[PDB]
């Protein structure tokens, strides 16, 4: 303990670019991060799919307008139908003047079929115009912008409407309200309403969002003779895929049997995937959810479609069994873990790996990506955990403890927190900056912990184990955000036991509830 301080301080004494001043700052690896916030889509805009090495918000605002309306009540259709077309032509004029005339043309003839039953000559009016000076010569739009357009509408409808376009100023609410207070007013009233939203911020908007004990729905898989390693659930919670131990992948459909190809051939709701040699140990889905990835022990990684239920690609850069394969949070890039004591990060277009990461004195059991998608967390049977820069290759941080192996890892959405689950049966919550576990949740008897997960907003996590039990844990009992909410060890809200079933996974849905998967029945 103190010997480590002695030896590392002597080391840093020998490192000539480590003086006594900054060596002590080096010993400030025990102050953690501040409590930070989640980027709501109120202020912070979206980002584009890119690389880890360092327009059409108008289109997305109009998509908001055409989505939020049709999803509304039936009473409010006969009035917002006329709120559709004028703002469409307004935003089209805005963009075609902004400097993207090609984009203007494309989303014009894409969204020219918006109000074709009302307006008949206006599509010909605006179809014979391509260039900006072709607008400056065109006169109908000039007289259009000269005067304003009348709009018949009630009060509370526009109130709630604006109160929907205040929460989403990320992919476009500001431009549309700006164009409105410019032209119609059926941003001065807009500014007063923004101040009203800020008044809602004062005690009308929820502050803490404290803990919330979860619902559950279980999925026990009968009749398998223990020939079954992994499960995995979907994104919109419609499918559950299980990887067997004889090169088989048996897609299941929740709520019906719509699993039919789009073709003319291939004429219930369970789809089996072949194309493998050895047992399957990990499976992962595409967040666009028309593809699927599946690793094995035959050093293959493989890609499947989901509109034909068919392979497309094979991948091979690994020298030994691949345990878990996980996508990026955005798509395009996926990663694998193996028994070759190394991990490879893939793309999907190129067939051989891009980067190889090597820091483990034993097998890399699990792999995961931090929510920015520029980091990877490997965990191993060497009783250690590691972090990597996908571009760099080499290990930014290492976490050590946990007498025993590791099996599963998780990341809390906000970027402070990773979960270590292992044969030791003690869940450990780690802080990336500190490198020292913030909490050491104790429970779960004396059995391996196979899977776990966090909330939508980091308020709560869930473990899931082989002691035939699931265990909801609060997480903010002693952290930098000590939410307590008062009336073996603590940080343990509740335990739900099962009918002699070892459990294998979870998937928090969008909503309150979890969704589980286990085996063995009784």
């Amino acid at each position: 303990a103190a010997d480590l301080n002695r030896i590392v301080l002597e080391y840093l004494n020998k490192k000539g670019y480590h003086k006594t001043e900054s060596m002590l700052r080096m010993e400030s690896s025990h102050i953690p991060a501040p409590p930070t916030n989640i980027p709501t889509p109120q202020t912070t805009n979206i980002s584009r799919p890119t690389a880890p090495g360092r327009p059409a918000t108008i289109k997305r605002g109009y998509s908001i307008l055409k989505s939020w309306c049709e999803s509304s009540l039936d009473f409010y259709r006969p009035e917002l139908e006329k709120f559709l077309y004028p703002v469409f032509v307004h935003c089209y004029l805005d963009l075609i003047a902004r400097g993207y005339p090609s984009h203007a043309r494309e989303f014009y003839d894409k969204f020219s079929k918006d109000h074709s039953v009302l307006h008949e000559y206006e599509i010909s009016k605006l179809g014979g115009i391509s260039l900006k000076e072709h607008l400056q010569e065109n006169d109908v739009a000039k007289i259009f912008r000269s005067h304003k357009f009348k709009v018949l509408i009630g009060r509370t409808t526009f109130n709630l409407l604006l109160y929907f376009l205040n929460e989403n100023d990320a992919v476009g609410g500001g431009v549309v309200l700006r164009l409105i207070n410019q032209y119609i007013e059926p941003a001065q009233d807009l500014r007063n309403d923004i101040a009203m939203i800020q008044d809602s911020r004062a005690k009308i908007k929820l502050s803490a969002a404290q803990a919330s004990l979860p619902s559950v729905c279980m999925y026990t898989f009968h009749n398998t003779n223990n020939d079954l390693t992994c499960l995995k659930f979907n994104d919109d919670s419609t499918m559950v895929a299980s990887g067997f131990q004889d090169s088989f992948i048996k897609l299941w459909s929740i709520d019906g049997s719509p699993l039919r190809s789009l073709l003319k051939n291939d004429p219930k709701g369970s789809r089996r995937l072949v194309g493998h040699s050895g047992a399957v140990y990990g499976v992962d889905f595409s967040p666009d959810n028309r593809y699927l990835i599946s690793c094995s022990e035959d050093k293959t990684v493989r890609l499947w479609s989901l509109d034909t239920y068919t392979c497309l690609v094979s991948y091979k850069g690994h020298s030994s069994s691949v345990w878990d394969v996980k996508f990026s949070p955005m798509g395009h890039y996926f990663a694998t873990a193996s028994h070759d004591q190394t991990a490879r990060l893939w793309s999907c277009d190129h067939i051989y790996p891009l980067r190889i990461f090597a820091g483990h004195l034993n097998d890399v059991d699990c792999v995961e990506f931090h929510p920015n998608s520029t980091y990877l967390f490997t965990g191993s049977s060497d009783k250690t955990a590691r972090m990597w820069d996908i571009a760099r290759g080499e290990c930014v941080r290492v976490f050590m403890g946990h007498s025993g192996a590791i099996n599963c890892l998780a990341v809390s959405p906000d970027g402070r927190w990773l979960a270590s689950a292992g044969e030791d049966s003690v869940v450990c919550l780690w802080d990336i900056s500190t490198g020292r576990r913030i909490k050491a949740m104790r429970g779960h008897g004396r059995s391996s912990i196979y899977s776990l997960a966090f909330s939508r907003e980091g308020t709560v996590l869930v473990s899931t184990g082989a002691d035939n039990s699931v265990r909801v844990w609060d997480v903010k009992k002693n952290t930098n955000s000590p939410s307590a909410q008062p009336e073996a060890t603590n940080d343990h809200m509740s335990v739900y036991f099962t009918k002699k079933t070892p459990v294998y996974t979870v998937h928090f849905t969008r909503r309150n509830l979890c969704l589980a998967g286990g085996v063995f029945g009784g």
């Binding site: 999803s71 009540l73 039936d74 009473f75 619902s215 709520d255 939508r456 969008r510 909503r511 309150n512 509830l513």
Partner: protein
């Protein structure tokens, strides 16, 4: 609002929120004096509640089977009873059943509308009733006695059989 949320699970509480919508949508007013707004928007409020009901049944029609059953039974029991003591409650029943489906109306409700058309005596809300029912059978046209009455005129075929009280004849003269 609570139903446009996305972080809320609302299976456990449908069978406790239904009564509010129904006791409001019927709106059996012991008073409701004439005030120039007793019905100028009360009809609209009943309509909003009916559309809300349509949303609720369309959403949670999978985790329960007894709900839409119970809702349909409650409303029709409160419907046919001649002691509505006000037209507005029956109007709410009519416009809520309107935004339900296609078939449970025409199986049972034709005889009962004939019944309380024999009973009722109004001048103007009867006109609104028969005209919104004309549009009703019009949206039932593309998907029978009312079938011929909407497709064809039904001159003394569906009228002499299915119409009576000199009220459905007014709507038949209004349109086919």
């Amino acid at each position: 609002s609570l139903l446009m949320n996305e972080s809320l699970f609302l299976e456990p509480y449908v069978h406790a929120i239904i009564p509010c919508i129904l006791t409001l949508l019927l709106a059996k007013k012991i008073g409701n004096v004439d005030d120039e707004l007793q019905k100028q928007q009360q009809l609209a409020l009943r309509e909003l509640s009916a559309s809300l009901l349509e949303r609720v049944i369309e959403d949670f029609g999978s985790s329960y089977s007894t709900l839409k059953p119970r809702i349909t039974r409650t409303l029709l029991r409160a419907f046919v009873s001649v002691n509505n003591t006000t037209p507005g409650t029956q109007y709410g029943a009519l416009l809520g059943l309107r935004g339900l489906g296609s078939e449970v109306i025409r199986i049972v409700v034709l005889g009962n509308v004939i019944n309380w058309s024999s009973t009722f005596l109004e001048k103007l809300q009867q006109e609104d009733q028969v005209f919104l029912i004309d549009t009703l059978i019009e949206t039932l046209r593309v998907l029978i006695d009312n079938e011929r009455l909407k497709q064809r005129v039904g001159d003394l075929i569906a009228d002499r059989i299915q119409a009576c009280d000199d009220a459905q004849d007014i709507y038949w003269g209004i349109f086919f």
